[model samples]
Target chain A: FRKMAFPSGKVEGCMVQVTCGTTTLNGLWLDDVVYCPRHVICTSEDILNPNYEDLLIRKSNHNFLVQAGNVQLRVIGHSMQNCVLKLKVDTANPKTPKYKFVRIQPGQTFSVLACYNGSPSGVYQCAMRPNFTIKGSFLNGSCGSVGFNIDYDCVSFCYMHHMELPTGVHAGTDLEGNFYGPFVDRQTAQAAGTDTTITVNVLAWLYAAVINGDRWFLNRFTTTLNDFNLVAMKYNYEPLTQDHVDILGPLSAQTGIAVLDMCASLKELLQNGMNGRTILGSALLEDEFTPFDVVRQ
Target chain B: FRKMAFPSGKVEGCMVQVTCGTTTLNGLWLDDVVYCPRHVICTSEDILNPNYEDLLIRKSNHNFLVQAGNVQLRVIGHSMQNCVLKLKVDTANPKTPKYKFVRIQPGQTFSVLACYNGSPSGVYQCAMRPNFTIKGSFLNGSCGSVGFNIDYDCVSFCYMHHMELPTGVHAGTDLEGNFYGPFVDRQTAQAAGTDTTITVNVLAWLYAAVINGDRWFLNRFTTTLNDFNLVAMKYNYEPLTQDHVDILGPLSAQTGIAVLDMCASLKELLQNGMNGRTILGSALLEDEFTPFDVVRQCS
Candidate 1:
């Protein structure tokens, strides 16, 4: 190896150890400005290189052929979908929201498919092969498309035009305070509203983060008291079932992961579906539901 | 009060245990076999008795006479301008679902004043010269009533065949995992699809209950996991702006009398035509909305 020494940039120090590197090779230069940032070392490459395949147009035409294409969908930094098929959504990417899931009532369901684009409107479908396909269209005759599915998680509520019901029974009315906890019984209001067993239903949310060994429960435990409108509820709501202190006793007693893991198991089974109304929590009895299970076509 | 006792119809346990009570009160016996454990209750009271004043009704002839009788229109709880109203949905009567405050999307928000039945097909107006009135009427040539409000608290949504934009950035068939939380973004998906936004939207839910500490998040959060077709996402979100957090947070955080006080404030706003999304939330920035800060009477 040949050693050469003449530097454009230099350093000087007194009684200091020295390290040096010489610019011996010709500095490369570009003939033209490239269409990218030179100093940009931190642009989100993931967001920038949006998977073209994920954004492809999937629609159908009324007159002739069908057009279908694949597209990219990402759930950036997401944690997990116990089963939710959670693809974070946005108009252009999966970083935000616009609208959400529509619960399918027991009597009705929606379809998961695609549709067309223009005036004498159309989508050019695949004329080739045994399983020929179709194209998608746009809103207002423009060239665009969207996706729809069967799991239309939907619900409807009604109110008396002239209410004989008390204010407390009407959860939305805010006149009275009623079921306001995770005690599971809170659902009584809304459910009974449907059945009309109760005059009105009121709701109050219990924040779990306030409890736990982290002393979070203490947050709710020592809530400011109110006599007329709100007050801390009792643990022994009725003598029939005493709230087991041991179940929520102390986090310090079960700090280990194993203890918490066991509780996670319970959380897996008991969670209510569609606003804690436990209709078997989605997969009722046999535990077999899938895209294949629900949709045949 | 006389000490009650169950007739010696041979019942176990102490009578004072309150398991069974003896009563001289006359009660009608209802004997219907094979009832679905879930059945809605309705009483004949609301149907038989109705107030005539503050009513808006059309005769056997016209659609909008705006007089006193029954509010004629559609009212399957859709809350559209043309909603036919039904006079018989009274919650206190234990037979009808309170048509007002139905918790569909962004669950529950309303305050009720009075309830009464119409004479066959009667109409009701906003009592005391009120502006936000609800009307109910019979359907088609057939007779049956539907009820809903023309007030500002409603924003209709159901399985209606309308345009829907998925709540995410990614568009197209970008198959991902099950959505356990609210999708908070605009959809980049091509709007022109054989399938509407609902197809890909089978995923995503509002994580507001989650972040706001509502446990319902755990429902979808738990079920949509550990399955073959339903794969949980690794990353998640519940998008709302700082302003929304500030308003709804403290409000939700308040408890006891404060919760009721908050409701009072919310009730006034709602009656004046404010929505949960529009007030106390970032949805204020959403284009097509007005808070109805003041209750105007077509002035």
Candidate 2:
């Protein structure tokens, strides 16, 4: 990792508020590190830089495990109403493919067979995406970012955020795409009795490309759909509760935009051959560790 | 299922909403019939007389298979967001206790092999229930009557009715939960902001009950769960979609409190035996063939 490479090119620049990074040391793993007191990491570069560091973030697992074992893929944080688990397994790297998705609930874990064999070793990985109101037109185009410094274990795959909808009926649907207000009780409630579909899109993708994710997932596929005759293993999060509703479509743009932005930045950083930082062994959890090293069960 | 006795005592209600009879009418099986829309039915004295013929209602399938081939025991309406399913094989009475709920989701389905298997040739049934919330509170309430309702196809699910919270955050966390709001372009923005520990707790429990549902669901397992498994199993509609967050819950309760209130009324009616003009039936959709009977699949 190089020096402070902010959009300003300086340690403290006005373009992107200099609230962090100008520390005594250099880089560190974002995971295992927590900006305590207020675990809320709100800033421009700092809030949006968890992609470069290894810190505890939320996640979801999307993979096809053929092994007939008690392989559990549990959700990490607080979920809004629904999420997708796009799982895939190439029983034979050079033959027919097996792609399956299992929509997971907040606290409930969806398990599958870890079809472990010799020829093709299956890989699984899960990423959490907030299903918001499908508002706006042709990419509603509204986004924000936040990079919170926290521990992986505590926030490991734990869903924390939710989409806040609009005042009237939402113009669009959520991930599962149902019709109507998808409000749960305390977990999710209408902030007001005002008319309109309260639309709020939570972005977990900011952490997806590098940090935040969903259930147990691994992405190490060798063959493509053409070669192995793979199919888009789609899935629906079965109706698990009476109170919860599944709103289909990319309703809100909050969570997706941020996560994509984070992934993009991290991808750029990764292009520069970066992982995490190696902090000194001390009480102060630091931004360190490589992505390949961290992000493990 | 004889013509619901009708006019048990309470004044003398008409046959505006009569469901669950003993015969087949107009080629349609008289599993249960609804008179006016939403077509709610209950069992009571006012509905148990052998005199008046006041009963118009909705009919549901007595039994069906779940997760046939690749269709898995999944939800179809309301977008299957917070629902769960299980396969039950009855060693005694296959009509009930055929399946037990072990998991739930918005779209996907699981294997029913494990849940059932008591009697191979015997009658079998599959049951469903909402999963849990963030902290695993599905175990907290001891399974209550559902905080929500299922659409016609018995697919998808919803929460809250005011159309505030789910729509708000859902506005932010689309295809991307963390990808929030205020974006420059569709491909750019995704992060919808973050939350605190307290907020997280609140979201967890709410989703558990509203979305997936809490343990309070266990109690009504005998009725709702069984009915959905047996009845809805015979129907089909569009698959669950992300757009559900907008209208799912509100439709069930335009004012929000309608869910609990209606359930209470329905519960009383059920105990007394469903008869005459109920509030359910056509309130869900504005089309014909009932709400559950949708047009066709997308592609």
Candidate 3:
């Protein structure tokens, strides 16, 4: 498998801090869940959302259906106040409740995955999530000029790098509505583009989204569904459902507001043709030998 | 969760070593898997078993129906003995056989879960086993007096420390059929026992295997089974089927021949109380306030 790109170095943490109003969690962030070194307590993002000053960076990922596999919990007493963390277990026998305890010094984090049965529980707090706000206000707005990068490996095909560009750098769409530019390696790309290798249908939906302001096409890319399909397909696994996405929403953000924001930028380019200032998406059709050169048995 | 005692310090690696026939696999153990950090070419035991004069330990966890969870492959050239490892992927397109490559060395281990879509594979090995051989397993055998330690927490009930005594130390069974150790810490355990805490059914089967020359019982314990039930239950997961046991047989030796050998020793105790010499099963009944003393949220 090719090493997938990580344009944003610390991806999930960065997005979490961004959406949580820059809550400097050191190295922690959450949306609808809070991830401790040992457990993932699913909860509402608003609680840890610094936008609300609710001191609860430690209160999520609690009470959710947890799956424990070699976990170690290292907790800290956030403000110099030592805290005794209690991890309770339901022994299926009501008369005898099981629990594990670890003392945490101020600002210290401790964890462990040994000793507990993976039974769902909620002694003090159950993991919960607020309903999603779709805020479907009509988009009389605009979208990216880069054509998605398509890689062909014999029978398998994948579209990569759909949203990375410095905005408003397009050379405009060709007669066939193909748009791509701001190329880092423009000389080689240009030579390849004019040859008999340019593929057409690949750009049809992407161009239509910007040209006709097709909100449906634009919205599809911004939803959790879009993010999951691409991720699941790339890893050759099952695609996550909406519910799976929600419980894990805080763990990481797939496509975000920036994607929609950029979607608007692309629409502007389609309309004003160089009148707008968004960078066009760079497209490099690389067919060079990837890593892992096959040697036979 | 109480820390389950690791009576056998390096369990996984040792089992791997034993199955590989004393094949000295140099590495640490994790759960029931002995990861050799360098190689994973499954092979037979005799060629590598410790009893032999040979030395090729890269032969364990082999033949087990393994699962795929984010695997990585790293290759190297060892003494010029290079190998081509083929990682096949089952993809949507037939013509495009998605394959990953790794040039392995005589001293390296490589693996992966890719395009074949990580659906979980055992096609090469179905992981099954139920037949057991009860080689008379006669033991003018002896036994241990250590009681099985039991613990309780609200939603779980596990009897910890099943087998611990040295192979042969017998004292015969209590009227209640409970047979324990020659006491590593006997005085304290004996006092704790008669203080009105007795849970018997727990040991009913474990003891019968010893006390009654329970041949069928001995057979059951020695098969691939004893391993899986312990493993599965420990994970709070379902017990492995015979197929699963077969696949994982080499990974662990639950209640093996040694257990039966010792069981036979216990039978000797019942026959004449002090007839023959044998190792006894150790059992300690410990009950004290374990961790997690709840502090009321409000004072």
Candidate 4:
């Protein structure tokens, strides 16, 4: 355990801390930089040293095959360097692409998932920024190419016309074969319309998020009255629009969940398809219907 | 006034309760078909003498006009015969065309209106079924010349295909200029589908009733479970036949009155133009809509 002391550019009281594995090092300022003589300190060499398998592309390099599920990352190098792996996304091309970092150990493979705040479809990579040692092929500086490429595809709505009856009944259909139909009764339709509108609004939020690739837009879709209102306000609707109350209030009331929970349930269904309409208050009987139900497919 | 006593023909315990212009006629049956001798009593002459108008035609005499709103019946002749008058509805086809009669007094006229049970269009007259009186012209013994005619019309429904959005949203229209509409959001459209189906079924029931022209068919409509089942029974729908309620049920719960009321409301707007669906409910919005208000026109 010999310490590499750099008395040349040393500054009083300024100690550089270098982190490795779960360990931290107090470095001394040497020539033009601070040096942690532990040699095994940080940089990309140790990891690509042959214990790990060749990094192969499961889907695309950094494209994150939208919903092609998860990709597995293997630790191929035995003596790998640069334990701190920076997952960088960018270009304003001048800004950060939601930066995050991960640590790697020897003979250990890791799975890269999503960030808490989702990153948009863009060029991104995981590598050592400045390699002090000759790492894998990412030597002469940044690992721009232990190379990464990106791609994206999003879900969208596709509509079609449907049947209309002699009684003035109208309906519609979607590519998924789902239908929007008319109600048998007015009040039922009215009530159901409220539910439908809310659901559709939520969907709009989702579509907006995917298409625009902005998490801020997605964030506007909280079911909370205040949060929901903020979104509505942005759309020029009131803070407490009737549509808001009609949709969420009744749903929460009947579902016995608080407004917050109701909002949560809505997001749950949207994201995970958890609680469907049948889980609501009414007996979804033969005669029960709403206008939205009767009008479109 | 002299009362005619019926010594020749009288039944025990059978009392005839005769009434006229708020007045009762208590007569003892005397000679052949004789009653009060007041002369202004019940007879066709007092109302149809030449001095009043020309009493003419008979059943096989002259054809009466099809329909007339109201006609004046002048009381003129003194020696009027046969106080009992037959409001003949059919000549070759003798049957009930939904009838009722009104009593006439001196210079007092009466207006006739129909019962709640609507009747089919037909020809009817106020004259005698067979006026034996050799009154005025129309002397063929019938007052078909006075000419009473009747006419009627019914309602119908019309539909059209309409607008759709890129997101798979679409709707329709009725001739009434009303609309069925697309959704505010995808989720909205999804929820809306359930309601729309139920409503369409309800509309089916209403259409069935009006088109069938049978209250019996209309009877099949009900938001009540008990009454609805009964209607189903009448149509043999309980044998598991498809009826309006069955089609419209499962769509709603409870006696369904709630939903039925909802259906009624929609119709009220469609027919009454009360609440239009912002036209967006159907293309009726941009295209504009009209309630299914107008029906048969006499013009």
Candidate 5:
């Protein structure tokens, strides 16, 4: 490769690197011009010629269609030429439609994921599936469509919010139907103002508990669970007993090979309707079942 | 003055500067020796010759016997030789007695103050008066007592705790008899937690308000009162009205000669039973009076 003159009358060159399935090639860049060896054909069609079905299936089963709170759909592509994939969330009567563009390159796989924010109440559900379109310049000097549609239902857990209260000294329900109270003592109960008593929502409490439980499991092998105990005392909330701590100990001990494996045990339980069950030794319930029963199963 | 040798076989001299009323003297120091001219006699009795009655009365009226929360008693002395004053609080059946020592020097006056922490309830009153003992080395080399007893009653404002609530939607009283609520809005009222509401004591709120009022007075010619408004909104408490701000405006503009003059106006009002009065446009009351009525006593 050699430096060439441009219309701007400045001579310059850059080393452009390209990758194939098992090999790489070094090409020369002179302004807008690309110089490559005769044997190599750096084109979109030649680079992206892989089994698309396997890639889509693996991502769908492992990452997508999982989280009860949100749904994330990702698309990745590779090409030697300047290629881009455009995605649109096709909801009916949207105030303004959302669009995302992912650029692809040969040396690296560029990907983008469209996120849909949701809640346990299933308030945010999409009416239709989103669409994706790929555009790139080919070796034959053409650019056109390689498009597909995402076909999946938005899954959620609406039952977590509408559950029976576990047996204890509860105050009442808030505006959002979340329970609050079972004050630490009689003094706290008597001194409680209307605002103070109602604002400590039980859903938020349970969410904090689960997150702390994850932390507790991670902390045992390395440090004390002092912070978990302190949070319980500070908020005047009921704590997880030693029995509960024992239950989480074995689950956290197991090791995994995947990148997303730290909270795999808890994530699996949550995915399998753990939120729709009761938490033991506490004033909270969904059905007659508890996390212990679900974990045993 | 001349350098003298010590038992440690080191010969060194240090320049010592002594100050009297409108006059100063240079002396020489060799280890434990202080040498001066025959005309200048450096003694404790000659240097600290001020009238004790006048000094005590001035400090009492200005600094001591003030502050609703605490009382501070200070003692200062000046001497040419090494002198120290010892103070003891004579409380009944004390777990441990408190003592303080103030060292005296020639070039400057050394002082020390004993602090007694109190509250609005006035539960921490002392049963007996405290005592002070002065010990020093004169030019003739004699050390003995020049002691005196402090005679002053512990003053406090216990009425700041118990007062009728001002006209508003108050929730109730906490464990400490401090009132809590009259939340910002209906939504906040309905969503309130017991701990969040009761934990916010009105006395603490009032104290915060007065401090911020002092800040507002200082910040007016410099910056905005944004933080003052933000505290009111965040706690969901009633804020001081524009009329109240206008009342404090002129009070802050007055210049003072002393070092402790920045919040002198507010401090004067507080010392004169201002805590036992209503704060205007707020959901709080103490008797039937307000800070506005007190400040209007002047031009």
Candidate 6:
């Protein structure tokens, strides 16, 4: 099997030809230039190899008076290295065809397929479980030669879904809007010291939710938030209450916002909350709630 | 005397006329529109009322079968409120004239003169000791109706000169450039936990030096710096060393600088310092030293 430019001058499409033993089979490559397969749906922008650059067919053919062969097609670009491979399966011996060129987009679950490290040269089946999605890329490593590189977009989901949060503290956004908890009441929040568990839980949830799963972003956000909380408690001579967390969560997520900006926003929200305005209502209006679009692998 | 337009249409100059009881004493109103008195030397910009706006003369005359009166001149504006009053002291008495509208500029020691609360009206002497300088203004309060408002420029001196630091840590700038302490050496700094007295001293000195003595600036700087120090010790999992203080001192003084900027500058300085470069040298190059312009009320 070989990659050939379609005679129609239409580079937007490609065809796959497979020959096993005496049998020759041809099928239109169903992976669209701008569309992923039905089993792995994605937008055009999410298609890792939109141009299908560097398409290569690695074929192993053995002949002893008769010819027996195995063929696999893949892309070897930086993002598509060691991805799933598309194998030619014999019609008489039906089996799932493995596609090595997996395109993991943002907000998808992260998972690694079977390892391709020095295994016998045979077709491998790579599939995502039902409701499971693909994102980022995994290179050769522990799980196998094919692993996920864990891009920021996909890594953000890891924090959201994997990190264990305090029980009863369910934080997310919904039709009614964003929310965190029926946090410990005011007296409890106060009695629990400056950084109440409720406050930390809320901050953690907000951090994981807005950071988009980036480790760097998460690290910076965590340190800065802790510092801010410390200052509020120590120097400012105030406690870090649920109200403070509510105000900070939204402000921290905002781009180009500053400490003073956060302080001013918190002050306004707290004062309003004290003056007959619901803190939750004001926080919700300030984008305090994280959106619910996380996909787990 | 009434303030009439100068014959030359020059608003840059003003004349003061003082008429005493049976004796009228008048000088050029020796206070230059731009130049302060020799006793109170200051740049033109430091002159609070350069234009001499709202110059008022309050005169109390008692004609008991003879023309007798006492007169005083002063400015009553936002900044010049109840400053020192300019009095017409008879040369025969050889007493110093009292000027109510004193213009206190930056880097001057803070002090309150006699209280001007409803006391029996008389000339009050308000003078800075020979080497003392004036700054900010005093409003009516506990000290008196006339008190220093303590502008940021002047208030900074209070922190530098008054706030006590640990023994053996002296911070200031000199002809040899900026210097702070023969601080405890590295081993001592390390053993002292995240914030050594050395580190705190250096940071405090730097904060006082660059903040220009503003309370608001001080509060903000203090909180932010403390937060930064905590992060360095806790999250970043690093001790607060003199090297860190050296780097942060200069970067913090910079206008519009940020935490990330401070971190980057610190990293470069520390790396250079380790590679046979003096950390002090790098810090000095980064503007870490505070200038020595503070004037104490006495010393």
In candidate 1 the C-alpha lDDT for residue A154 amounts to 20
Q: If both were scored by TM-score, which would come out higher, candidate 2 or candidate 4?
A: 2
Tens digits of per-residue lDDT, candidate 5, B195-284, equal 211111222223333432322322222213444434434544334345444444443333221112322322333335344343422323
- TM-score attained by model 1: 0.15
Error of 5 at A187 (Å): 55
lDDT by residue (B161-247, candidate 2, tens digit) is 000122122211111111112321121223333321121111112222332122222123223323322322332222222233232
Docking class of 3: incorrect
User: Can you write out model 3's per-residue Cα lDDT over B73-99, one digit (the tens) per residue?
Assistant: 221111101111111212122121122
Per-residue alpha-carbon lDDT of candidate 5 for residues A1-297, written as tens digits (9 for 90 to 100): 000000000000122332223222332222232222211232344334533333333332222121112322221221222111111112221111122222211111011111111110001111100011111111111111011111121111110111111221112111122222322111122222222111112222233345434232221122134443344344433334454444444333332211123223233333343443434333232221122222221
All models: lDDT? Answer: 0.17, 0.19, 0.20, 0.23, 0.22, 0.24
lDDT of 4: 0.23
Candidate 6 Cα errors over 4 Å, as ranges: A1-297, B1-109, B112-299
**Predicted complex 5: DockQ:** 0.01
Q: Against the true structure, what is model 4's DockQ? A: 0.00
The root-mean-square deviation over C-alpha atoms between each candidate and the true structure, in angstroms, is 32.7, 28.1, 28.7, 38.1, 32.0, 35.3
* Local lDDT at B111 for model 4: 12
TM-scores across all candidates?
A: 0.15, 0.16, 0.16, 0.15, 0.13, 0.16
- Which lDDT tens digits does candidate 4 get at residues A97-122? 22222222111111111011111101
What interface root-mean-square deviation (Å) does model 6 yield? 47.8
Go through the candidates in order and give the clash count of each.
Answer: 145, 273, 74, 104, 7, 32
* Candidates in order, interface RMSD in Å: 46.4, 32.4, 20.3, 61.1, 46.3, 47.8
Scanning candidate 1 chain A in windows of ten residues, the lowest lDDT window is A6-15
Question: What DockQ do you compute for every candidate structure?
Answer: 0.01, 0.01, 0.01, 0.00, 0.01, 0.00
Model 6 chain B weakest 10-residue run by lDDT: B1-10
